[PDB]
Amino acid sequence: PIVTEQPSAEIREAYIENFAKGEHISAIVPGQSISGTLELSAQFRVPRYHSKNSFQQALQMKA
Amino acid sequence: XXXXXGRXXXXXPXXXXTXXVTXLXXXXXRXYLRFHXXXYXXXXXXX
C-alpha cells in the first residue's frame, strides 16, 4: 500500500510499447510515488473567538 | 464557562538567554561530418 506504481509488469510493458509507437492503451499507468495526502483546510480551521457581531459592536463602542 | 460577554473563548485547552514569554500570547514578560560539403572533392580529383 505504500508505493502506488501499477503492480502488473505486463500492462506497463504494453503501455510503453504502444507509447513508442505513438498509440494509447486502455489501462492507466501512473508514475511511482508513496501513498498519502495532505488535506490542509479540510482540517484545522481558523477559530472564531469572536461572535458574529462582536467586532462591529466594539467598533460602535470604540474599543 | 469561560465565554465572556458574547465572546466564544470556550474552545481552549484548560487543565544564551532564558527570556520569559507570556503563555496564551507569546511576548517577553553524435554526428561527425562526411566528406562532401566540407570543401574537398569540390576542388580536386585530377582523374
HEC readout, chain A: CCECCCCCHHHHHHHHHHHHHCCCCCCCCCCCCECCCCCCCCCCCCCCCCCCCHHHHHHHCCC
CA gap A15, A4 in Å, rounded: 17
Q: Which of B6, B12, B1, B11 is nearest to A50 (CA)?
A: B6
Contact A35, A2 (CB under 8 A): yes
What experiment produced this structure?
A: cryo-EM
Q: Does A61 touch chain B (CB under 8 A)?
A: no
Resolution (A): 2.9
Contact A50, B7 (CB under 8 A): yes
B28 forms beta bridges with B21
Closest residue in chain A to residue B6, using alpha carbons only: A51
3-state SS assignment for residue A31 = coil
Residue among B2, B8, B9, B25 with most chain A CBs within 10 A, to mutate: B8
B7 forms beta bridges with B4
* Contacts (Cβ under 8 Å, ≥6 apart) of B8: A48, A49, A50, A51
